[PDB]
Paper text:
VNARs are the smallest (~11 kDa) naturally occurring independent heavy chain-only binding domains in the vertebrate kingdom. The receptor-binding domain (RBD) on the S1 subunit is responsible for engaging angiotensin-converting enzyme 2 (ACE2)—the cognate receptor required for membrane fusion. Here, we detail the identification of a series of VNARs from a VNAR phage display library screened against the SARS-CoV-2 receptor binding domain (RBD). Crystallographic analysis of two VNARs found that they recognized separate epitopes on the RBD and had distinctly different mechanisms of virus neutralization unique to VNARs.
Among the 12 interacting residues in SARS-CoV-2, only 5 interactions are conserved in SARS-CoV-1. Among the 7 residues that are part of this key hydrophobic interaction, four were conserved, two were replaced by residues with similar properties, and only one (L452) is lost (see arrow annotations). For example, Ala348 has been replaced by Pro335, which is a non-polar like residue when cyclic, and the aromatic residue Phe490 has been replaced by Trp476. Fortunately, most residues that changed are still able to form similar h-bonds. The final major difference between the SARS-CoV-2 structure and the SARS-CoV-1 model is a result of the deletion of a residue equivalent to Glu484. Lastly, Ser63 forms a backbone h-bond with the carbonyl of RBD Gly446.
Numbering used by the authors:
A (entry chain C): 20 to 129
B (entry chain A): 334 to 528
Write the structure that this text describes.
């Protein structure tokens, strides 16, 4: 059905870190993480987030969740962050579509 | 009783080509004349069967694959084609028996500022076999050095967004595609036409 992404909004000072969690919801079928991405204010572009260095990700099939962690936050990290998953659906779990979380609006100050 | 072809063509959502969908059609009657007598398709090509004769034919099973690609890639959805789509996303066999149908879907699948929700695979260690599907997301090692799951030079994420913009010319616009496979095996037929 859907992906529940938390937190929906966030404010942090420079140096802190942000953790985002995405829970696959209303699914009796399997799913997989596709990627995370950001939209910068005033732009429609989706910038995929490459996982390395200060971007750490994890996946927890037991809890039907996947997460992203961002360390050493800077002002330019202010953006809305999204999680994308590929989810099987339908009676026999025979179809698949991509679903996005509703996003985390990150504001970074100082 | 009546095959659910409406659900395939009319579906509000379509798959990304790399994660293409397949619907098995069986134990039902199919009136294909509704398709071929429709002028809303930009491509309608059959291989090994004449579409007008479908309404008087029976098959063991029918399969309906669906996905979105750009207009100038529809050419790759044919037997014996090469290209990123044919090689790395959706491959028909050389002896394909079925029909390829497509139409411009700019008015559903384009978005102002760009629709990034349709993806394709850009790299792969080897070509797909016919009707193989690959939904993996491993970093692609394009040079000699192992990537160890980290992106960088010659270490590439293998999926890429189309980014369909309404201001794009028609070759770059999204096309919805339906591939019908007609399977004939030594078994009772379960998909027949109205005759
Ligand atoms: C899609 O739905 C409309 C509903 O009015 C129907 O007339 C049409 O035949 C359907 N398309 C197909 C391919 O069955
Ligand atoms: Cl994490």
């Amino acid at each position: 059905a859907s992906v529940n992404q938390t937190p929906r909004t966030a404010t942090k000072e420079t140096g802190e870190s942000l953790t985002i969690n995405c829970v696959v919801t209303g699914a009796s079928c399997s799913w997989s993480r596709t990627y995370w991405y950001r939209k910068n204010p005033g732009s429609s572009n989706q910038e995929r987030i490459s996982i390395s260095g200060r971007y750490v990700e994890s996946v927890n099939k037991g809890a039907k969740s996947f997460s992203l962690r961002i360390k050493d936050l800077t002002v330019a990290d202010s953006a809305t962050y999204y999680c994308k998953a590929l989810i099987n659906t339908g009676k026999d779990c025979t179809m698949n579509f991509h679903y996005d979380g509703a996003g985390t609006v990150l504001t970074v100050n100082q | 009783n009546l095959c659910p072809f409406g659900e395939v063509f009319n579906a509000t959502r379509f798959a990304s080509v790399y994660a293409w969908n397949r619907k098995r059609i069986s134990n039902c009657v199919a009136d294909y004349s509704v398709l071929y007598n429709s002028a809303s398709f930009s491509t309608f090509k059959c291989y090994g069967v004449s579409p007008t004769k479908l309404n008087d034919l029976c098959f063991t099973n029918v399969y309906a694959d669906s996905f979105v690609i750009r207009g100038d890639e529809v050419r790759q959805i044919a037997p014996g084609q090469t290209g990123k789509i044919a090689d790395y996303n959706y491959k028909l066999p050389d002896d394909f028996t079925g029909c390829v149908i497509a139409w411009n879907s700019n008015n559903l699948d384009s978005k102002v500022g760009g629709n990034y929700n349709y993806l394709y695979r850009l790299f792969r260690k080897s070509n797909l076999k016919p009707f193989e599907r690959d939904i993996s997301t491993e970093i692609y090692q394009a040079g000699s050095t192992p990537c160890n799951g980290v992106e960088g030079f010659n270490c590439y994420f293998p999926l890429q967004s189309y980014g369909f913009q309404p201001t794009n010319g028609v070759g770059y616009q999204p096309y919805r595609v339906v591939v019908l496979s007609f399977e004939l095996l030594h078994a009772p037929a379960t998909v027949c036409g109205p005759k």
